[PDB]
Amino acid sequence: GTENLYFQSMMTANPTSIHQRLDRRLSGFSLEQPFYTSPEVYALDLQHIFYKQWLYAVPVCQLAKAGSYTTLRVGAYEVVIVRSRDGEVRAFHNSCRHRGSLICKARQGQVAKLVCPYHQWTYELDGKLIWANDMGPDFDASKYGLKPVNLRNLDGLIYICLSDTPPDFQTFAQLARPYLEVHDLKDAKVAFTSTIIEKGNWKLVWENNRECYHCSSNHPALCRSFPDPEVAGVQADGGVSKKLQAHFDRCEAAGTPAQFVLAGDGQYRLARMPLQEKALSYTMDGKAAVSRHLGRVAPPDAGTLLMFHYPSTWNHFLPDHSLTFRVMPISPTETEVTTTWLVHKDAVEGVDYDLKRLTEVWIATNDEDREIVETNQQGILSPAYVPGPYSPGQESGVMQFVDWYAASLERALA
Amino acid sequence: GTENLYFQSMMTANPTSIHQRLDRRLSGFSLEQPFYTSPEVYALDLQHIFYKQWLYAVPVCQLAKAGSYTTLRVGAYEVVIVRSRDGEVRAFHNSCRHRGSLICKARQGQVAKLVCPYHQWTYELDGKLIWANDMGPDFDASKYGLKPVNLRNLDGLIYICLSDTPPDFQTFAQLARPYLEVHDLKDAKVAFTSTIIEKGNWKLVWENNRECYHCSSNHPALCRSFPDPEVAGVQADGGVSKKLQAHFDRCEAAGTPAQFVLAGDGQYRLARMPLQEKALSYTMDGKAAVSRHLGRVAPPDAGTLLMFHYPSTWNHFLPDHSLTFRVMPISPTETEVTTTWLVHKDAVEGVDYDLKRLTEVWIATNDEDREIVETNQQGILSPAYVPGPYSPGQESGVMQFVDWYAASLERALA
Amino acid sequence: GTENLYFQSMMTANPTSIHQRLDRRLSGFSLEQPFYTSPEVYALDLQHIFYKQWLYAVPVCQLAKAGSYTTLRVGAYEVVIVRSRDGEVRAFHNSCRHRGSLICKARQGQVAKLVCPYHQWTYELDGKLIWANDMGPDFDASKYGLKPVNLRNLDGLIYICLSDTPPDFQTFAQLARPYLEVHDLKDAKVAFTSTIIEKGNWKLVWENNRECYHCSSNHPALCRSFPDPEVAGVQADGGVSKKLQAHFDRCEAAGTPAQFVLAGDGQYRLARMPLQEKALSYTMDGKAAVSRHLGRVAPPDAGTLLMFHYPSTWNHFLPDHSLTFRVMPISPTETEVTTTWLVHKDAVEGVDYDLKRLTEVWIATNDEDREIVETNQQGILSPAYVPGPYSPGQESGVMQFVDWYAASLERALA
Ligand SMILES: CN1CCC[C@H]1C(=O)O
Ligand SMILES: CN1CCC[C@H]1C(=O)O
Ligand SMILES: CN1CCC[C@H]1C(=O)O
Ligand code: FES
Ligand code: FES
Ligand code: FES
Ligand SMILES: [Fe+3]
Ligand SMILES: [Fe+3]
Ligand SMILES: [Fe+3]
């Protein structure tokens, strides 16, 4: 399948010549092949994008309990996120300072201390090394605490940054707070998590996400509740339609922030968009999936709070529940997408919601997107693939993403 | 197995130094290791051989119907071959000009138009882009038709060439026509297709094919019907035995071209050779597999029309049925071989032929060749492998192939 | 799992700069990441370590019979070891001198001659080419015998060396003989063989082996019979404890060599160490596994003859049976470990020993070590991994190994 096509295609590819490629790039066109297929560009994307920008990791409700921890891989990093004894959430490199071992092997759990499974070096939940067996009298444990990972809490959503010099997160955090706080995400629980691998480059997953040019043919279930190019894109940035604005006004008159806002540098966007017709949620019948709402959004037909933050996440926060999506790179032609359904912590499965009803729409959607992304990746692997033009009407959000990515890479290579 | 051996062997391999290796090559010896094992030479073989020469794709009878199409991968290219509305067979790159997607996902089918599954850009069966949704009023669809692939019809067998500057095909086509036309291949149907992966370099598959030095020990079934070094090789090029010539004369007196002919540059060869003993076909009992013949070959014991055309194909055309073989590179140590059994279009399975009887000999043979090729590849992966001498008597066809390959590569690197 | 982590980690790794890394290395610290993760260092480890030093292959009792042979892969080499007609054991490259094929496909067997399966070139059991079909009258078979592999017999254990210029083996052989001869290994048979792949670099397998810092937490079964840092390491090299020396004296008064000895260059070590408490063998109850002993070791509580010889082997020779361990590199993050249980040739399964009782302890131990090695490898793959300090008390044997490896590599690159 794709693994072999990947190998075949890179055999005859011309040199990456990344500066030349970046120089000649036009914003109205899809990217030249090696951006989507080459290990050279993939290495750059890790080094300069995923290892430098803030990334969505997990909802904070996953760390509700004392000594609770969750682990994730970002590229080659293995990160552990923990609720320390002081109630603070902190992140560390999941690598013992002795000989490097993973410390936490499970995806989630609770501990009293972080105990290396190899020789039992023992760390407090704030990373300090509190016991190391037989290291001699001049061993200085202060030099051998776990390495910290920069971490922020975005109103109930934990973000991390693998750089020692992280970019400004406060601008985004301040902008987003009014929109997110009404969802009370700190009072959520995880109802369901779905993790899939899509056999396409992470950028193809994002280009796919940033348009609904493909949705009428490809997403029967989603199309019952998700609408219009102005919804899914960014042409509302140059000015809002009267019908859309009336929706924003209904939300905001009711005390729910809605207005479309786009970062200066294009990194992130928030907008609370209307749903189709009379739909209220992402369900097959269009009605709320959960009877006990997560948050205080009003009115009931407030629709979907769309939030993207490149490179890691897109999100849908509805009046009754929320969904977060985490995009993580696996190889030049593979990307991991993790979808997390968030419901009120006291919402009871089988009473306030049905698992199938809650998840079926986006399970189906994700599978459809995956098939499309994978088909797109396979064609791109041809040596005959050349950039093609994006639709100005239907793909302005795709251009906006690709521009963000190219600018980010350019700045990092300067 | 071989995948790991491949990785191990390339770790310590000396530099490819391809010009030096080509310089010191002697025609009487097998090739130095990296020709058979290195990704560097494999990349060259794709770029300079498979992407530059004409290649056998499929029988034209697979495209008998209106709107019919078949897809194939050549290296990293994905090609679609289609019967257009004017009755002409044409080939295209199976990559949408929008964002690159595969258009035809199935191996075979029928369509009215080529409709991209992603955003439904729609193409006529001659590649023209006839509808693109919402591209703006200055989109010029004339610039965005599917990219054509050079295609020839060799008397019922479709050949393609991935280069914008294809080599001369007419010399071969003219030579071959008299031999092939008597098989009426345009009136065939595909009775059976077998696709296997052999874990050896494509050149090892060809060296294996071009001798019967290995056949008495390794091919019990084939040896009941397939003969003698003069059959399988090229020593008839310097002059024909009296017994072989008498066979050619029996065929040709009956109006069936037979005489051994070898290209100037060694690319191709045709000869109608006698079968063993009293055999008439490649079956366990030696009798015709199919009672309704494909073509008008006479006499009934005309034997096998051998045709090879490097790098893609060898073929056996018998009085009752025909077999085509397509060799396609998968990685430095993997090669795809596709065997196609062709019978008269009106021959009925279970009445005029039995599927098992028709296919069992060459299914077995291919499996035996595969085991041999794979065993050979595994030994070659050793760093202790050094070229060895070919048998002048039994491997003159192997030398002839290796000479063609080296000359072709030399010319392409000049 | 690890395969993908390997790929991710090498994408962003800094250049290998092997001389600089070797220059700055401190003996008290674990190695910088690329020693354990990079294909560049793995290639060096093959070229300069595994392809240059003597390596443990198999016990000679596996070649007891006339025409008997055994095959093994070392890196990319395929080696065949054979008992020739003169009774001598010899090794060859398992690659036919014609076109390179493997000759012996099975792991073990008996033959009269070595017959290539491809075109039946036939070799005597001392490698001479005695028949080649149809090679012409000026073919000189004297030039086309199998390529020999340097081979030594270490008191019943066959060692090989892939270099044309092997290092001195006699120093080790002379030192080891008194300790090994009392085990009568030439009179052994193989009771059981276990081959596992551990997903860590070969060096991580060795560092793991060379300490029991991890054993109390990780090896419940082994800890019932295997003891103390002085046992498993090398601090007895600077001087022996009174309790350990008393053990050596009990052995040696009984005519069984025991005293700790360490090579000048650190390559190898032999010591006959006491077992825990009252244990006599590696069994769950601590009693002898086999009632008919392999060899003449006395007293019955002589304990374990530990022998390591880098890079290929560690070994435990007990009064009742013996175990050999062979370490072979598979990729930068994979290593093959082969454990061989040796018992007296006349010991009868189900009468003198029970297979489960004999093997269960070290089957369990190996599986525990494997899990630990693999967990360690996964943490090391993080870009945040940095060298950490070894315990002077508990890891002196780890330092000693890493010093041997670094010195060996330095000398080979000079
Ligand atoms: C349209 N894009 C943005 C939202 C949904 C996604 C998709 O088509 O599934
Ligand atoms: C002998 N070669 C050429 C024809 C058949 C092939 C083989 O041995 O199967
Ligand atoms: C302690 N090392 C050396 C001997 C045993 C090995 C282990 O812990 O299994
Ligand atoms: S690797 Fe963690 S204590 Fe040794
Ligand atoms: S990729 Fe084909 S229409 Fe968009
Ligand atoms: S490869 Fe061994 S005889 Fe030909
Ligand atoms: Fe979609
Ligand atoms: Fe064959
Ligand atoms: Fe252990």
PDB file of N, CA and C in Angstrom, chain C residues 46-70:
ATOM      1  N   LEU C  46      28.816  -3.107  13.555  1.00  0.00           N
ATOM      2  CA  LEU C  46      28.978  -4.248  12.684  1.00  0.00           C
ATOM      3  C   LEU C  46      30.330  -4.289  12.068  1.00  0.00           C
ATOM      4  N   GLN C  47      30.714  -3.239  11.371  1.00  0.00           N
ATOM      5  CA  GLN C  47      31.980  -3.279  10.648  1.00  0.00           C
ATOM      6  C   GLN C  47      33.193  -3.522  11.552  1.00  0.00           C
ATOM      7  N   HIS C  48      33.232  -2.841  12.699  1.00  0.00           N
ATOM      8  CA  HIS C  48      34.447  -2.740  13.504  1.00  0.00           C
ATOM      9  C   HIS C  48      34.456  -3.644  14.721  1.00  0.00           C
ATOM     10  N   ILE C  49      33.292  -4.141  15.092  1.00  0.00           N
ATOM     11  CA  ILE C  49      33.195  -4.992  16.315  1.00  0.00           C
ATOM     12  C   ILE C  49      32.756  -6.395  15.964  1.00  0.00           C
ATOM     13  N   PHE C  50      31.530  -6.549  15.451  1.00  0.00           N
ATOM     14  CA  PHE C  50      31.053  -7.903  15.138  1.00  0.00           C
ATOM     15  C   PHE C  50      31.752  -8.577  13.963  1.00  0.00           C
ATOM     16  N   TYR C  51      32.263  -7.836  13.000  1.00  0.00           N
ATOM     17  CA  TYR C  51      32.915  -8.420  11.877  1.00  0.00           C
ATOM     18  C   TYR C  51      34.418  -8.516  12.086  1.00  0.00           C
ATOM     19  N   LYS C  52      34.917  -8.156  13.290  1.00  0.00           N
ATOM     20  CA  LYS C  52      36.364  -8.172  13.522  1.00  0.00           C
ATOM     21  C   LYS C  52      36.780  -9.047  14.701  1.00  0.00           C
ATOM     22  N   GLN C  53      35.861  -9.321  15.630  1.00  0.00           N
ATOM     23  CA  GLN C  53      36.235 -10.044  16.843  1.00  0.00           C
ATOM     24  C   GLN C  53      35.754 -11.493  16.770  1.00  0.00           C
ATOM     25  N   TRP C  54      36.360 -12.373  17.602  1.00  0.00           N
ATOM     26  CA  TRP C  54      35.864 -13.698  17.696  1.00  0.00           C
ATOM     27  C   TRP C  54      34.517 -13.715  18.342  1.00  0.00           C
ATOM     28  N   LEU C  55      33.641 -14.590  17.865  1.00  0.00           N
ATOM     29  CA  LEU C  55      32.227 -14.682  18.269  1.00  0.00           C
ATOM     30  C   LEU C  55      31.866 -16.112  18.597  1.00  0.00           C
ATOM     31  N   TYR C  56      31.144 -16.333  19.677  1.00  0.00           N
ATOM     32  CA  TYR C  56      30.541 -17.626  19.993  1.00  0.00           C
ATOM     33  C   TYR C  56      29.441 -17.947  18.977  1.00  0.00           C
ATOM     34  N   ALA C  57      29.496 -19.120  18.399  1.00  0.00           N
ATOM     35  CA  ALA C  57      28.482 -19.571  17.444  1.00  0.00           C
ATOM     36  C   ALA C  57      27.601 -20.631  18.054  1.00  0.00           C
ATOM     37  N   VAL C  58      28.119 -21.832  18.252  1.00  0.00           N
ATOM     38  CA  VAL C  58      27.298 -22.948  18.705  1.00  0.00           C
ATOM     39  C   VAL C  58      28.145 -23.960  19.497  1.00  0.00           C
ATOM     40  N   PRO C  59      27.484 -24.819  20.290  1.00  0.00           N
ATOM     41  CA  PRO C  59      28.290 -25.906  20.957  1.00  0.00           C
ATOM     42  C   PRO C  59      28.723 -26.918  19.968  1.00  0.00           C
ATOM     43  N   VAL C  60      29.879 -27.551  20.120  1.00  0.00           N
ATOM     44  CA  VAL C  60      30.365 -28.480  19.114  1.00  0.00           C
ATOM     45  C   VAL C  60      29.526 -29.774  19.076  1.00  0.00           C
ATOM     46  N   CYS C  61      28.832 -30.045  20.143  1.00  0.00           N
ATOM     47  CA  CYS C  61      27.996 -31.252  20.194  1.00  0.00           C
ATOM     48  C   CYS C  61      26.877 -31.190  19.105  1.00  0.00           C
ATOM     49  N   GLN C  62      26.486 -29.983  18.724  1.00  0.00           N
ATOM     50  CA  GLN C  62      25.586 -29.833  17.534  1.00  0.00           C
ATOM     51  C   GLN C  62      26.171 -30.381  16.230  1.00  0.00           C
ATOM     52  N   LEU C  63      27.443 -30.663  16.150  1.00  0.00           N
ATOM     53  CA  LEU C  63      28.122 -31.159  14.951  1.00  0.00           C
ATOM     54  C   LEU C  63      28.759 -32.529  15.284  1.00  0.00           C
ATOM     55  N   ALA C  64      28.060 -33.323  16.038  1.00  0.00           N
ATOM     56  CA  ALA C  64      28.619 -34.597  16.516  1.00  0.00           C
ATOM     57  C   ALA C  64      28.706 -35.602  15.387  1.00  0.00           C
ATOM     58  N   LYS C  65      27.775 -35.497  14.468  1.00  0.00           N
ATOM     59  CA  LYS C  65      27.644 -36.500  13.467  1.00  0.00           C
ATOM     60  C   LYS C  65      28.384 -36.204  12.174  1.00  0.00           C
ATOM     61  N   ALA C  66      28.722 -37.276  11.470  1.00  0.00           N
ATOM     62  CA  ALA C  66      29.395 -37.167  10.148  1.00  0.00           C
ATOM     63  C   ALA C  66      28.488 -36.399   9.154  1.00  0.00           C
ATOM     64  N   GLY C  67      29.059 -35.452   8.423  1.00  0.00           N
ATOM     65  CA  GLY C  67      28.305 -34.584   7.517  1.00  0.00           C
ATOM     66  C   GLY C  67      27.298 -33.595   8.167  1.00  0.00           C
ATOM     67  N   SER C  68      27.392 -33.439   9.462  1.00  0.00           N
ATOM     68  CA  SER C  68      26.483 -32.580  10.150  1.00  0.00           C
ATOM     69  C   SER C  68      26.844 -31.118   9.933  1.00  0.00           C
ATOM     70  N   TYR C  69      25.812 -30.287   9.885  1.00  0.00           N
ATOM     71  CA  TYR C  69      26.012 -28.867   9.653  1.00  0.00           C
ATOM     72  C   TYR C  69      25.015 -28.065  10.434  1.00  0.00           C
ATOM     73  N   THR C  70      25.372 -26.829  10.720  1.00  0.00           N
ATOM     74  CA  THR C  70      24.463 -25.853  11.358  1.00  0.00           C
ATOM     75  C   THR C  70      24.749 -24.498  10.677  1.00  0.00           C
TER      76      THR C  70
END
